Structure formats: C-alpha cells, structure tokens
Design a protein around this nucleic acid. Structure first.
Lengths: 254, 33, 146, 94, 82, 167, 184
RNA sequence: CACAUUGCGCCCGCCGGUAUUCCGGCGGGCAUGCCUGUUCGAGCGUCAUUUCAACCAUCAAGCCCUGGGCUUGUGUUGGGGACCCGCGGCUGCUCGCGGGCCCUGAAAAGCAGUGGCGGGCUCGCUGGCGGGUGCCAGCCGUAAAACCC
C-alpha cells in the first residue's frame, strides 16, 4: 500500500510527499539495512545461541561472498558495505578470543574453522578476484538470504562482544576506511598454545601476498607486529621494507 | 505516390498535434480477502 | 507538379536553415529553402521561405504550425499564392550565408599602405571640403587655420 | 505540546540489544528435518595436493569434454606452484 | 453564481441543451436499475437548495416509478412513492 | 499550448497542506523567538465564476469532461461576454493534479509575479489567437453526426424499407 | 518524430559549446591547477546529445564512448587540457585506495586481442603485462595508485569500468569517492 | 445450513484418548439491506507520458614607485524614420565603417553579397595527375595557413 501511495504521489508530481513516503518505506537502497525486521523470526528459528552458532556456517559463507561481490539492485552497495563491516567485526572477535583453530587453502578458496562455545564453525572465502556471474543466477533469492543472515550475524556479534566484555558496535572511522584499513579500521574498546605461536615475532607482507587472509591468521594466532606495502593499505605496523626490526617476510615472486 | 505523401503528411500532423503516444470470457477477478 | 511556397515568420533564434529543413522534411519533402538574413551582420530577420514539392503537404504543414508557440514566439505559417510568388525569391536558397567582418576589412584596408599622391590631391579636395566647412561656419563665426 | 520548527538541514543532520535476553531451553520438535552440513574439504581440493591425487592429461581432457551436471565430482584436483598462480574458482557463485 | 446559472438553465427545460441532456440521461437510467446509488447530484443547484451538503453522510439515490393512475386517483404523489 | 499553460500554472501551483503547516510552524517559532501578497492558481467553480463576472481573471482554463456538464456549459459564453481569454483543456484530473485535489473543473490566473507577467501575456496572446480563432470559426455549429459505415448502411436500409412502398 | 522545441534546444546548446571551446582555446591553460602528477578517475555520464568533433575525438581517445564509463588518467598538461575540454560530459576527481581496490577487484576486466576478459587470474595478468614487471593484480594497483613509469600500459590494459546507475545515490576532489561507492 | 434432527458443513485454536496424519469434545467465528472508511481490483470510460531547465569571471592572473591604481579577461533580437555627423573608396552621382535623435509587444512578406585554404561530390588524362562544384551545422581574409590525417 505504501509503494502504491508513493507511485501515486510521484505520478502527481508531489516530490516532497513522495520523499516523505519513501523515508517512511525505509528502502534498503538508502538504509543499507534489510527492509523488514526479522528479529522475531531469528528468535523463533533459533531459540538458543547454540542453534544460532550451528547455522552461523552458512551465515558467514553468504556474508563473505556478498562482501566480496559487486553491487546489484537486489543487494545494494550500502548493504554490501554493511556485510563487509559485520564480517570484519566477527573477524575481530575471532582474533581477540583466539577462537580460530584451523585453516585450509583449496582451488575453491580458503576454508576457516573456528570453535565458539564448543561448536565448530566452518566457512569458505573466495580469493580476491572478479567473480564470474554467468547463467541464470538470481540475486533476489540470494538477497533475501543476505538480509536474513545480516540480521543473524549482527545479533550474534552483539552477544559475542557483550559476553567477552568489549562494547558493540566497535568504533569505525571512515577516514581509515577510505585510506584502506580494512580490518585495521576498527578499534576495540571495553565497557566500564594459540596466542604464543607468533607472539614474539614481527612479520612483513609483500605486495604479492593475500593481505586479508594472512593478516587474519596472524592476528588470530598472536603476531602483534605486522606490516605491509603502502599499496596494501593503512594499519601496517611498519611500511618500510628496509626496517631491520622485522623477523619474517613473505614473498611469492619468482 | 500521392497517397503515400499525403499519409506521411497526415501522420506528421497527428504527431505534432497529439504527440507520439497513440479466454475471451469474463470472470470476476480474485481480489484479496 | 504543383510547387508550394510557405512563408514562416516570427522565428525563434536558433530555428535556422537545418532545423527548418529537418522539421519540415519530417512533414514532407523540401525542395528549396531560404531564410532572410542581413548582409551587414549574418543575423536572421526572423523569417524564411520554404518551397515544397507538394502543395497539399505545404498546406498541411502551414495549418499545423500556423499559431505555434515556440520559445516565446507565436509562429506565422502561411502559404503564398502562386500568383504572388516572386519568380526569383529563392535566389540564395540551399546556400550557406556567410558572416563577413566588414569592419575588420575596412580597417586593414585603412592601414594598407599605398602611394598617397592621389590622397594628397584628395587633401586638396578635403581642403575644398574645409571651404564648405568655412561657408557653413560663416553663420557660425568660427575661423580656423591649416 | 508541539515541537518548534527545525530547519531541514538540522533535521537531516540529526536523522542494539540482546536477542536472547530471557533465554530458556525448549523441547526439540520432531517434525523439524535439519539440512545436512556440507562435507568437510578433502585432500583433493588443496592447490598443492599430494601428487597421487592429480589426474592424468587424458582424464583431464575427458573431464573437460563431458557435459556439466554429469560428473561424480564437480572438480578435478590441480597442482599449482604458487597462490598467485592459483586462479579464481569459476563456479563459486553458481 | 454558477448555481444561479444552473437555476435559470433548469427553469429552461424544453430548451435544446436541456432536452438533449434529459434524453441521453433518461436512456442511461432506463439501462440502470430501478433504484440505484447516484454518486453525485445530477442537479447540484436543486440538491444544495433542498439541503444537500457535500459531507460524509449525505447520500443521493435515484429511483424511477411508473406514472399514470390506478380511473381511481392515488391521493399521494409519485414523489411520495419514490 | 497545454504544455505551455501548464508550465506557467505549475510555477504558480498552490501550497500543499504539509507545506502550509510547515510555513505556519515557521512563523509561530519566529514569533516565539510584513509579507507580500501570495499569487496562486484559483480553483473552484463559484470562486472562478465570481472572478470572471468581476473581470479579475486574466486567463480561464475549463475542463472538457465535467459531468453534470451543466456546471460549466455556460462558462465559455460567460467568458466571451466578459472579454476574458479562456481555453478548454483535456483533463479535469490534469487540472485537479495541477491543483492539489482530485479534480478541478476550472482554474483561473488572476495575477502573476513581475518575473512572469510577460510569460502570462504571451500565453494570453497564444491561447486567444491559436485557439479562439478556430473555435470562433467552429463553436456556433452543432456537433456529432460522425456516421460510420455501419450507421450509414443501416440508414440506406431504413430508407429503402420506408420510402419505397408503404409507411 | 522530433520536435521544433528540441531542434532549437540543440541549436542553442551547440552554440554554447562553440563559445565555451572558443574561450578555452584562447585562454589555453584556463584550469588553475598546481603542478602535480597524480591520479584522477573520470566517469562518462549523461550530457548534451550533440558532442562537437573535438570533444568527440577526446572521448574516443579516453575510451569514454558509452554512458557511465570509468577511466584512470594521470594529471599531465595534455590530460588537464582534455579534461577541461570534455568537462560537461564527465565527472572527475581524486580516487582513494579503497575505491581503486573495489574497482579493480569487483569490476575489473582485461583487454586481450581486442576482447574483454575478466581479471580472474594473475596468469593473464603476467602474460599481458609482466615484461614491464606486472606479475599480479596488486602490482597493477600499485602502478595505478602510486603512478609509475608504466601507467600508460596499465591504463591501456584495463578496459573501461562499466558501472551501474546510481542506486539511490568539474573537479569533485574527494566526493568522486562517494560517486564511485554509489555506482559500484 | 436445516421442521430445529438436539443432525450436517467451512475457518482459526485448544483438550482427552497409543497420535504430525485417527476419533470424540470444547472455545472463538461464517444471515440480508444500507452508511462511512480500509484494502484488493475491472473497464476497446477519460486523460497525461518522445523533459523549451540551470550550466561566462557573484572574481582570477600580471604589474607598478608597498597601496591604491592600472591592464587583460569579448559577451549586444530584428526592422523602420527627405532628421544631425565623422572617415574610406567612387570621373562624379553615391556606396560602405562607426556614431547622435526617435518609433516599435521577442513586432516581421524578394532585394543574397564578399575572395580564398582544406575536405565532400563529379568529369577527363596516364593507383597517381589535371579540371569543375547556389556543398561544407570547417575556418580564414584576400597569396596562403590552420583544422585534417
């Protein structure tokens, strides 16, 4: 009914009333959030945080894929940005808690397995390329799935951060976001075997290495002193490759 | 020839004055209840 | 074979040769066309003559675009009777009227050097021009030397 | 009783909770049929797998020639010398 | 003053315009039902003069009754029957 | 002509209820913490007829699909008698969406701003020439009688069924 | 059917491109930009229908033929001249690193034998380029962002980015980043 | 719903019996005309829909005798009136270039005249060469160049 009223006003020429009815309609195209509140649906589908953690598998698979994917009408640019933000926040929780356990590289991408509250959680992240969209691939179905799992992961991150004690949502700065901080754009403040492997080391990443996966792994298992080339983005501990206080350096050039 | 020219002129006139925009049985449509 | 002449007046600025050709060739087939422009400056005098192949087409076009409001200009489209069409009216039709810098030509003609022996016999002639000035200044009472 | 006028620019300038706040265990209904989890990744999938898994050139030719949606497995193992040489999967989104 | 213009026009009933309108409108009413809801007054001046207001609650219904007599004459009117 | 008239009248459309409430709230807030005469399109049969009889309306636009027609059947004659330029536009919904209603039977332009006085005068000239000359040619004659093939054939059938032998 | 209104409209428009091009030609170097060799993204958008021959050729050279295209160009003197010429039909600005990453990853393609190929493997990257030392997509990003000696070849390799209409969203400096976010 | 038999339908929910499917029971509902409103519609009923918009320099650069001034920033509807001028040609009559005065709705009924460079078109000769062209929404001022490629 609201959409019919918006079209009715637009066909009359009342642009101000059309805009007011649109902000009442709360389109995802502008909001960046799902069109409908699905809180009660998530609550009834998963009456337990354990069940939420058990479907968090497909939740993360969806969200990482659509955080990497280009923008369409079914899933807008702001919604993709929110997907990326939620994935990065979940990655920060994993880094802080050292919940990440095992990893794998395949012709399919990269597999991550973590353990949150006794539940094994797997997901596949594609390699940073231009993923092909060929054939009769319908993004509206995947858009509905994306909205559901965005709400689900948002509530999951809230509960995780509240349980650990850190405040949710983490502060996020558009300046470093634009300058390309990716995971380095979030500062985590509080509220008022795993972490030893690379702890007392210092790592540098060359321009030919996967920055997001390598950084996720190293932050999850300890390395607190990581740098990379300026092209890779902000947040590097040291940008100068000449700096002699670097222990290990990653190369994939012939 | 002459008929074609007259038809083209009349079509242009109509476009200038009015613009360019211009089973079988019946059942009650199922509306929302 | 009945040619048809239409006179179009109160033309908006920018309703020139090619625009006229396109529009009235959408209406029909244009054989000849000539806007009226000033020789001094290449500016339209806001009227033009279009000579169509078909008289019926000309009549239809005039009836459709007679009192048309275009850019604050109520056009004037009227068919000229064949008895009143002056035989050489489309003398510069289908040609490209050019804008001549007459002032710039007169200038560089003035600064073009030339032997001023004739200009000095003309100095004598402009001295008799000064004689005419003197005779009109006798009523004035102003005497001037050379 | 009513708010005062406020300019549109200021209006535009001006304009989370725990879902399981009261969480209690619930009996599992017997009509629910959960979707099976995807099988873990195997030794075939890695970009540099053990060399015994790799197919021969003739088997690769047959695999590429035979039509899609007709295979036992939707992939063949492939050894790559480096991650930069590892390419993007063609059927990820599909 | 449009209502005054309509008042004079309705006084001129056999005039050409009013006769034409009454003919084509009589054909419509004969095609419709004997009693039907009229969306709006067909004679707005007469309606407003008799007390019709454009509020929510004022309805106009149109009715056709057979004319003539029963040689006995009915004491009430066709208006009363309608 | 419809497009030009509606350009001017869209420039002079009246305020919506939301806009009027916003304006009144603005002045109320200003008073808590001297204007010129507004110029808008006039609508409503009684208001417009009053303007026409008082010669305040400079331009009149009358919808063609008014039913009962008797509400506007006199308007062209009244405008011609009073000397006010008028035109008949296809649309009481077009006219009513020009105003902020569902249907306007007639609208009028009485006074415009100085920035649009020349535009209004040019529209008056255009309307009066390019519409009133043709309607003066054909407005006193009867309409209708657009008999098609079926109607004409039915009428030769009737004439040959009546005028030949018996009546 | 084309209308006389439109005919007069393009006539007056073309008159104004003629006048504007005359001013630019006579005050060659009109754009008062400090001398810096940096990157600007240029997006071909909707404008006036009849493009004069010189802007048409400049758009042909910059590969901004179709509406909503995107090209990376280094700010030289000839480039500044060309952008000032084709200003009405383009929106240009200074890209940031996140925009460069998103454009090259999400909507990045490659040109081979005059054929569009998506940037799906560093193999094709190092086969087309690489004789210049471009082994990977992030090396291409390095050249484009920190413009190097081989920016010309990097740009010619990258096919123009075919963006999408803004889904509810001259020199614009850093706000072209918002525009790229909207169309990407 | 039904001579009303304590019988039979349909929707939502619940209870008890081996119960997700079965049986029985229970609770809340399902008449017609009409009014106001909501929402979903139908109509070879009527209309609109190929967008007449803004888009120079709301100040810049160079200077001088240091603080004011100067320079450059090319942008004008058309037509008419035995009216008043200045300068170029014309044996001369006069015709041009620019002003002074007045009139007119963004008004309008042949008056078209100045020499070229390139490109398009076309014809002849041996891809090439030479001629023409009321053609250039290309330029310039008399050669020619630029544009072009």
């Amino acid at each position: 009914a609201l959409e019919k009223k918006i079209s009715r006003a637009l066909g009359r020429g009342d642009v101000s009333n059309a805009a007011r009815l649109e902000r009442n309609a709360n389109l995802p195209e502008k909001t960046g959030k799902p069109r409908y509140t699905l809180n009660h649906i998530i609550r009834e589908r998963y009456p337990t945080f354990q069940d939420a953690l058990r479907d968090l598998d497909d939740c993360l698979s969806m969200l990482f894929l659509f955080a990497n994917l280009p923008s369409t009408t079914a899933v807008p640019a702001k919604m993709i940005a929110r997907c990326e933000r939620l994935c990065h926040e979940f990655q920060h929780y994993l880094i802080v808690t050292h919940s990440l356990r095992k990893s794998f590289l395949s012709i399919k991408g990269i597999y991550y397995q973590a353990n949150i509250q006794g539940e094994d959680i797997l997901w596949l992240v594609p390699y940073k390329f231009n993923q092909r969209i060929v054939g009769d691939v319908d993004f509206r179905i995947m858009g509905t799935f994306v909205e559901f799992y965005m709400t689900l992961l948002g509530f999951v991150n809230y509960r995780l951060y509240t349980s650990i004690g850190l405040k949710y949502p983490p502060k996020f700065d558009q300046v470093k976001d634009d300058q390309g901080a990716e995971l380095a754009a979030f500062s985590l403040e509080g509220l008022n075997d795993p972490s030893q492997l690379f702890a007392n080391f210092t790592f540098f990443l060359s321009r030919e290495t996967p920055r997001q996966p390598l950084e996720f792994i190293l932050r999850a298992f300890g390395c607190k002193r990581i740098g990379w080339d300026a092209v890779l983005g902000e947040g590097a501990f040291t940008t100068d490759e000449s700096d002699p206080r670097i222990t290990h350096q990653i190369i994939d050039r012939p | 020839s002459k008929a074609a020219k007259g038809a083209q002129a009349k079509k242009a006139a109509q476009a200038a004055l009015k613009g360019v925009h211009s089973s079988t049985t019946f059942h009650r449509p199922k509306t929302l209840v | 074979s009945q040619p048809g002449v239409m006179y179009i007046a109160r033309l908006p600025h920018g309703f020139y040769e090619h625009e006229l050709r396109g529009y009235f060739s959408q209406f029909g087939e244009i054989t000849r066309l000539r806007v009226v422009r000033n020789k001094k400056t290449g500016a339209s005098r806001h009227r033009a003559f279009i000579e169509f192949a078909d008289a019926e087409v000309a009549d239809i076009a005039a009836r459709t675009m007679d009192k048309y409001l275009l850019f604050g200009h109520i056009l004037t489209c009227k068919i000229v009777p064949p008895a009143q069409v002056h035989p050489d009216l489309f003398k510069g039709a289908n040609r490209r009227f050019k804008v001549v810098p007459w002032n710039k030509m007169a200038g560089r003609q003035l600064e073009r050097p030339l032997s001023e022996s004739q200009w000095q016999v003309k100095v004598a002639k402009e001295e008799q021009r000064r004689a005419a000035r003197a005779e009109k200044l006798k009523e004035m009472g102003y005497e001037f030397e050379a | 009783r009513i708010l005062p006028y406020k300019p549109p620019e200021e209006r535009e300038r001006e304009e989370f909770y725990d879902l399981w706040q009261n969480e209690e265990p619930q009996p599992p209904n017997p009509m629910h049929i959960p979707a099976p989890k995807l099988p873990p990744p195997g030794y075939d999938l890695s970009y540099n797998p053990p060399p015994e898994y790799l197919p021969t050139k003739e088997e690769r030719e047959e695999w590429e020639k035979m039509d899609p949606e007709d295979r036992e497995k939707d992939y063949l193992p492939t050894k790559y010398d480096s991650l930069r040489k590892v390419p993007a999967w063609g059927n990820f989104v599909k | 003053g449009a209502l005054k213009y309509l008042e004079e026009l309705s006084k001129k009933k056999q005039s050409d315009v009013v006769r034409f309108l009454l003919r084509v409108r009589c054909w419509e009413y004969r095609q419709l039902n004997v009693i039907h809801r009229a969306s709006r007054p067909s004679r707005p001046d007469k309606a407003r003069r008799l007390g019709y207001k454009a509020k929510q609650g004022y309805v106009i219904y149109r009715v056709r009754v057979r004319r003539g007599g029963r040689q006995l004459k009915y004491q009430r009117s066709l208006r009363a029957t309608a | 002509l419809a497009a030009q008239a509606f350009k001017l009248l869209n420039k002079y459309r009246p305020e919506t209820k939301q806009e009027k409430k916003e304006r009144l709230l603005r002045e109320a807030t200003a008073i808590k913490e001297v204007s010129k005469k507004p110029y808008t399109v006039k609508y409503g049969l009684n208001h417009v007829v009053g303007l026409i009889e008082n010669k305040k309306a400079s331009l009149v636009l009358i919808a063609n699909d008014v039913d009962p027609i008797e509400l506007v059947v006199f308007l062209p004659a009244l405008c011609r008698k009073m000397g006010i330029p008028y035109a008949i536009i296809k649309g009481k919904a077009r006219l009513g969406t020009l105003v902020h209603k569902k249907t306007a039977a007639v609208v009028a332009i009485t006074e415009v701003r100085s920035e649009d006085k020349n535009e209004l005068a040019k529209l008056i000239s255009a309307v009066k020439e390019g519409y009133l000359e043709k309607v003066e040619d054909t407005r006193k004659r009867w309409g209708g009688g657009i008999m098609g093939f079926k109607a004409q054939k039915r009428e030769e059938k009737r004439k040959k069924s009546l005028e030949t032998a018996i009546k | 059917f084309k209308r006389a209104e439109k005919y007069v409209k393009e006539y007056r428009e073309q008159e104004r491109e003629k006048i504007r091009l005359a001013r630019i030609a006579k005050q060659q170097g009109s754009f008062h930009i400090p001398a810096e060799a940096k990157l600007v993204f240029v997006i071909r958008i909707k404008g006036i229908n009849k493009i004069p021959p010189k802007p048409r050729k400049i758009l042909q050279l910059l590969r901004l033929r179709q509406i909503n295209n995107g090209v990376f160009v280094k700010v030289t003197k000839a480039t500044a001249e060309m952008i000032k010429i084709v200003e009405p039909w383009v929106a240009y600005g200074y890209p940031n690193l996140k925009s460069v990453r998103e454009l090259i990853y999400k909507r990045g393609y490659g040109k081979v034998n005059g054929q569009r190929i998506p940037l799906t493997d560093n193999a094709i990257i190092e086969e087309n380029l690489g004789k210049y030392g471009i082994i990977c997509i992030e090396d291409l990003i390095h050249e484009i962002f920190t413009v190097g000696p081989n920016f010309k070849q990097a740009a010619n390799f990258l096919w123009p980015f075919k963006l999408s209409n803004p889904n509810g969203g001259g020199n614009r400096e850093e706000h072209i980043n918002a525009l790229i976010r909207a169309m990407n």
